[PDB]
Structures are given as structure tokens and as C-alpha cells.
């Protein structure tokens, strides 16, 4: 898994790999396009809805390619347009992959004319001289998109910020500024000088971490934008549609096949039609799009910091770490700012989550009337300040806890990230003794001083991912309407059904944090497809414990004993058929494999919370008196 490491590639192979990946992306987008076909223009009843196309259908309908109708002409035209666009994507992707071949093997030669080409001039020597012309290159992409819309899809550029004609107008406005910004940087490159020397690890890490925040920004922008009246024709026109998915509860069949089955439906094993407006499909698609960019955005951030540490450690081993003028290094090359900076962030993280966790248990205590308490004794009055109540619809206590859980969750993960940034080579305790860090992946140093597990910077990356689950999962509850304000809600035990009315919620949330699991899984158990995902997700997750506990030496015991059984068992039952000697993962591989099973297993199940319906009512739930 280090075959494509950065210190082994030169500059051209990056361009070739990027071009090849763009071609692959074009292929898969075309695949999606023909996966979204309904009728096959020649007429061949096509495919049923799947989650891959339903995610992009609003964008197509906005562009006048697909449509929301079931007629003769409409589906015939939509299928033809989709086939044309898929073929165009296939062609451009093939060309791009061929260009990837051309740039990967140092062979920039024209096929028609016997010409050659030097990657140096054709220009730029360093990356700051390359920032410039790229902005000119992007100005062409914006210019082309405005041309493609206007010439092919109609939609003349008009500055009306309620219809899509504004998008065409904006692409021309942006091409003006990116071009104008492009020339100036071509004549005046900017200067963070250290990113040019080890430019394929340092500059890469900064970009990856910067892209991470960008993805989170578009994650939040989409959630707000898609719920506007302007976006209504493309998103909650989904509600008054009927969807046929794969894995739907099908037309059941008895053992008489005779066999009085189902509703009156001619196909046997037919897929039942599922209404998309009792099913909250308009919000389900919005949640799916938003969550994808949020979790991917966070992961890019962790990776960008981790690779910065790999570079940061390297310049401390040869000697250049002492040797930087970039202020991005001198602000932390002191070992007394690091403690102050890490101290002030680990205390703020202490002050914040203790505050919300005190509120959450106190609300939970007040419902169940533990220790003789009423719900009137809870924090049912802690609304956000009136200057902050514009960012919320129906401001209440549920918003107050959310705005702070995100802070508490974020700073909890920042502790690991800072400890990657600063203590890559030495820590105050490791320099307190006489000790090193030399490999950024060494698992431990032994049982000395009570234990030295997980001090390397790769391990610190694992804990940031593990601590980031709480922050990421809090988003899934909030966007699905889960009342994170108390840990039980709608429970018919003592007072959970009272929150409604003493707080004037004016909505109705699904449940509490625990009661979230009992509800929602009413629909998960109804679908066989969703049911298998539930079983697989839980199976993958707990296997993490096999490699995350302090047991690697114990597993090295049995592998030796095993090897001798399959060795003594090919001895007197069957004849000589055995030479295999069992391998056990090392501690470094154990944590790498463990973190993927833990992180992968939990989020394959989060998909079920989002892709099973919305189910948030608007009934104030009258008192349980």
C-alpha cells in the first residue's frame, strides 16, 4: 500500500495518473447515466431505481436532460439524451486515459508529426509559477461550461437568482475574475517558499487538508440551498412520485405455486410500488448528498494533517527543521508555545463537552423522574440568543446542544491533530527522558515505564478518526430529526412525551438518542435488503477487537500451535498434503486493519438511518395527562 508513494514519483507521472483517473470518472459517470434509463428508446423496459442515479436525478432534471413524468414522448426523449451523454462521456474518458498513458511514460510526442515536447518549456519551473497559468486554465473551464449550457441546453445567461439561467450568467462572471487573477500570479508568484523543495509531499498535504474544508463547506451549502423555494421543482417534486427500487418488499408467493399472493398485480415476485411522499424521499436524497461530502471532507482533513506530519518528521531527521523561515514553522518550533497551544485546546474541550453532557443527563433524569424530579426541573428554556435564532428554523433547546456538540466533537479530535503537528519527533515527556521517534509508524517501545503504546503519529491519526465518529454521528441524528437534546424521547415511561407542550416545539421529532434505535428499525426490518446490510455491518465492526486489543503476541502463540496441527493432521488422517504456516498481522498492520473495520463497519450502518425514510411529523403531540 505504498506502491504509489510520493517520494518515488516524478512530476509527469502525477499528471498522467490524474488524467487516467479523470477518464475513469467519465466512464463511471456514463455508467450511472445508462443506469438511470427507464425505457430504452427502441423500447426495452429498462431498469428500476437505485440509489446511485436517484442522487443525481435532480441535477439532470434541472439541466433538462431527465424529467419527472410518465408519458410516451417524455421517457423516449430522456432515454435518448441520456444515451447520447453517456456515449460522449465514454469517448472523452477513453481520450483522457490515452493521454494518461502519454504522460505516465515520458512520451509527449505527436502521433501525426514527428515532433517531441519538453515538460520544461512549451512555461513554469516551480509550483508558484504554475499556480498562475492554472487560474487561466480554470477560467477556460468556466468559459466552456457557459458555452455548453447556452449552445446546447438553452438557458441563456440572465441574472435572475431564482432560476438556473443565473448559473449560466455566473460562469461568465467567474471566467472574468479567474482570468484576471491568472495573469497577475503569472507575473507575481506568491510565496510560502518551503512547498517547492519537497513539493510532492508538502504541497500535497496542504492541498488535501484545504480541500477537506471545501468539501465540508459545500456539504453545508447544499443542505441549506436544497430546502429553498427555488429548488422546489427539482427536490420535492420527488415526493409526489412513486419509486421502484431494488430490494423492495416484493410480491410474496405462497407454497401453492393457486397461491393467493398479494394485491392485484400481474407479475409474480413483483416489486411493490412505494409512495415517495409518505416516505420522506425529498429529504432522504438531500441527506444522502450532504452527508457524503461532510464525512469525505473530514477524512481529507485528517489525511492532509497526517501527510504533513510525514513530511514534518522527515525534515527533523536530516536537519532542515531548524532551517525554515516560513512563519508556518517558527510559530511552533519552540516547545513552550506547543504546550500552551495544546493546553488551551484541551481545556476548552474539557469545558465544552462537560457542559453539554451535564445538560443531556439532567434532561434525561428529569423525564424518568429519577430521584423525585419533574420535567419542569429540566433545561427546557435554554434557547439560543435572539441574535442567533435566524440560522435555525424553530429555535429550541435541541439546537443549543447541537451547536455545542459540534464544537465539543471538533476540538476533541483536534487534540490528536495538534499532537500530530507538534510531537512528530519529540514530545515534552519523550524529551523529558532520553528518547526518539524515528519511523512515524513504530507501534510502541515496550512495557518500559508502564507501557508505550500508540505514541507514533500514525496511531494519533487513528484516534482522530475514532474520536471523530462522535462528531460525525451527531450530524446524522441532527439532520434526520432525532432530538439529541435528551437521551430518551417519545418513550412511554414517565414524561418523555411531555417535551412536546412544555417547550412549544411546534414540530415532532422521531425519538431520543437511545429510542432512536428502536424506532426507525421498524422499516429496516421490513426490507430484506436493508436487513442484510444490518447484519454485515455489525459483523465487520466487532472483528476490530481481534486486532485492537493487546493480544498480538497471543495470536502469535496459536499460529505456531496451529501450524503444527495442520502439520500433525496431514500425518495420519490423509497423507502428506501440508506445507502452510500461518501468518499473523503485525501491530502496525493490526491497527491499520482494525481502524478500517471499525470505521468502515459503523458507517455502512449509518447509511440505514438516512436511506430508510425521514419520518418527522409536524404534530405538536398533545400532553400525556
Amino acid at each position: 500500500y505504498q506502491i504509489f508513494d510520493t517520494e518515488k514519483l516524478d512530476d509527469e507521472q502525477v499528471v498522467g495518473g490524474h488524467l487516467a483517473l479523470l477518464g475513469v470518472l467519465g466512464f463511471i459517470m456514463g455508467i450511472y447515466y445508462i443506469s438511470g434509463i427507464q425505457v430504452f428508446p427502441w423500447g426495452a423496459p429498462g431498469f428500476h431505481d437505485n440509489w446511485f442515479y436517484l442522487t443525481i436525478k435532480p441535477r439532470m432534471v434541472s439541466l433538462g436532460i431527465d424529467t419527472y413524468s410518465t408519458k410516451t414522448a417524455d421517457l423516449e426523449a430522456a432515454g435518448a439524451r441520456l444515451l447520447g451523454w453517456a456515449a460522449f462521456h465514454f469517448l472523452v474518458g477513453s481520450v483522457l486515459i490515452f493521454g494518461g498513458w502519454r504522460h505516465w511514460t515520458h512520451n509527449l510526442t505527436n502521433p501525426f508529426t514527428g515532433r517531441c515536447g519538453n515538460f520544461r518549456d512549451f512555461s513554469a519551473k516551480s509550483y508558484k509559477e504554475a499556480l498562475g497559468p492554472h487560474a487561466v486554465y480554470m477560467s477556460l473551464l468556466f468559459l466552456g461550461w457557459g458555452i455548453v449550457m447556452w449552445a446546447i441546453l438553452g438557458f441563456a445567461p440572465i441574472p435572475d437568482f431564482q432560476t438556473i439561467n443565473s448559473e449560466t450568467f455566473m460562469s461568465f462572471v467567474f471566467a472574468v475574475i479567474f482570468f484576471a487573477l491568472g495573469i497577475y500570479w503569472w507575473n507575481n508568484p506568491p510565496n510560502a517558499a518551503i512547498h517547492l523543495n519537497d513539493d510532492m509531499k508538502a504541497a500535497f498535504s496542504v492541498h488535501l487538508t484545504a480541500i477537506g474544508y471545501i468539501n465540508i463547506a459545500l456539504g453545508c451549502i447544499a443542505f441549506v440551498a436544497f430546502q429553498q423555494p427555488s429548488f422546489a421543482p427539482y427536490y420535492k417534486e420527488l415526493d409526489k412520485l412513486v419509486f421502484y427500487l431494488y430490494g423492495e418488499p416484493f410480491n410474496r408467493v405462497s407454497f401453492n405455486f393457486s397461491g393467493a399472493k398479494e394485491f392485484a398485480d400481474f407479475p409474480a415476485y413483483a416489486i411493490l410500488p412505494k409512495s415517495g411522499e409518505a416516505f420522506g424521499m425529498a429529504r432522504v436524497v438531500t441527506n444522502l448528498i450532504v452527508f457524503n461530502h461532510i464525512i469525505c471532507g473530514v477524512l481529507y482533513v485528517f489525511a492532509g494533517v497526517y501527510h504533513g506530519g510525514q513530511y514534518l518528521l522527515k525534515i527533523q531527521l536530516n536537519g532542515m527543521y531548524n532551517q525554515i523561515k516560513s512563519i508556518w514553522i517558527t510559530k511552533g518550533r519552540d516547545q513552550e508555545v506547543q504546550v500552551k497551544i495544546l493546553g488551551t485546546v484541551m481545556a476548552l474541550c474539557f469545558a465544552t463537552m462537560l457542559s453539554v453532557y451535564a445538560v443531556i443527563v439532567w434532561n434525561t433524569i428529569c423525564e424518568l423522574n429519577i430521584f423525585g424530579t419533574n420535567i419542569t426541573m429540566s433545561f427546557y428554556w435554554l434557547k439560543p440568543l435572539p441574535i442567533f435564532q435566524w440560522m435555525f428554523a424553530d429555535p429550541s433547546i435541541n439546537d443549543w446542544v447541537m451547536a455545542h456538540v459540534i464544537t465539543a466533537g471538533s476540538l476533541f479530535s483536534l487534540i490528536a491533530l495538534v499532537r500530530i503537528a507538534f510531537f512528530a519527533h519529540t514530545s515534552p515527556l519523550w524529551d523529558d527522558l532520553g528518547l526518539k521517534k524515528n519511523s512515524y509508524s513504530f507501534p510502541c517501545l515496550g512495557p518500559v515505564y508502564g507501557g508505550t503504546c500508540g505514541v507514533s503519529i500514525q496511531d494519533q491519526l487513528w484516534f482522530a478518526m475514532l474520536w471523530g465518529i462522535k462528531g460525525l454521528s451527531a450530524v446524522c441524528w441532527y439532520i434526520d430529526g432525532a432530538w439529541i437534546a435528551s437521551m430518551m424521547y417519545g418513550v412511554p415511561a414517565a414524561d418523555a412525551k411531555a417535551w412536546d407542550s412544555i417547550a412549544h416545539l411546534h414540530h415532532h421529532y422521531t425519538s431520543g438518542i437511545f429510542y432512536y434505535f428502536w424506532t426507525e428499525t421498524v422499516t429496516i426490518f421490513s426490507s430484506s435488503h436493508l436487513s442484510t446490510i444490518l447484519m454485515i455491518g455489525h459483523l465487520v465492526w466487532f472483528i476490530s477487537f481481534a486486532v485492537w486489543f493487546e493480544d498480538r503476541g497471543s495470536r502469535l502463540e496459536g499460529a505456531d500451535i496451529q501450524t503444527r496441527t495442520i502439520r500433525w493432521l496431514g500425518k495420519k488422517f490423509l497423507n502428506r498434503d501440508v506445507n502452510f504456516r500461518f501468518p499473523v498481522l503485525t501491530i502496525s498492520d493490526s491497527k491499520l486493519a482494525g481502524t478500517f473495520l471499525y470505521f468502515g463497519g459503523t458507517f455502512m450502518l449509518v447509511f440505514l438511518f438516512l436511506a430508510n425514510g425521514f419520518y418527522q411529523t409536524n404534530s405538536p403531540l398533545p400532553p400525556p395527562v
Binding site: 531527521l317 536530516n318 536537519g319 527543521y321 531548524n322 517558527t330 518550533r333 519552540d334 532520553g434 528518547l435 526518539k436 521517534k437 524515528n438 519511523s439 513504530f442 510502541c444 517501545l445 515496550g446 512495557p447 518500559v448 515505564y449 508502564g450
Partner: protein, 95 residues
């Protein structure tokens, strides 16, 4: 050959990374317990009658306590295969 390697006793912590690189035909590196292995009581050592001067033990840059030295053939003593140039530092504030 020349340039022996000589694990330091008092600095070793017993991480064992030095022991990994020594070729299996050459078990020149070993362990010594003499006590409970949690407060530093399993420090390792090098057998000089089996070592063949691979430099895998020194050139790998793995020892975190500076316990491997690699004394030079004539009289010189190393501690790590290259050391940064020991500058000295202050604080700045652009006014």
C-alpha cells in the same frame, strides 16, 4: 571486521528493534531480564563472538535511546549515523 557496535547497557530500553535486523544465521543480539519487565528490566545486549559487522544494527536508524554506538575502527565513537548541526535560537516579533 572493524567498527564494532556495542549496545550501551544503561541506556537501553529493550524495544528490540535492534534485534530484528540482525540476520537469523547470526544471533548476535540477545536479552537479559534480572527483574520485572515494566520499570526497565529486560535490556538487550550484543554478542561480540557472533557479530559480523553488518551495520544493519546501526545504519537502520532505529534505536530511540542512543544505545547503539558503532565505535570507529581506530578510536572514534558514534551515537547516530548523522546529527543535525546544533544551531541556537530566539523569538521574533515583526513590528
Amino acid at each position: 571486521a572493524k567498527k564494532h557496535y556495542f549496545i550501551i547497557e544503561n541506556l537501553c530500553v529493550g524495544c528490540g528493534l535492534c534485534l530484528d535486523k540482525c540476520p537469523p544465521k547470526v544471533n548476535a543480539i540477545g536479552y537479559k531480564f534480572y527483574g520485572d519487565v515494566q520499570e526497565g528490566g529486560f535490556r538487550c545486549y550484543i554478542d561480540q563472538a557472533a557479530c559480523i559487522s553488518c551495520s544493519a544494527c546501526f545504519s537502520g536508524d532505529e534505536c530511540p535511546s542512543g544505545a547503539l554506538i558503532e565505535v570507529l575502527p581506530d578510536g572514534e565513537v558514534l551515537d547516530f549515523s548523522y546529527t543535525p548541526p546544533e544551531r541556537l535560537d530566539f523569538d521574533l516579533r515583526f513590528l
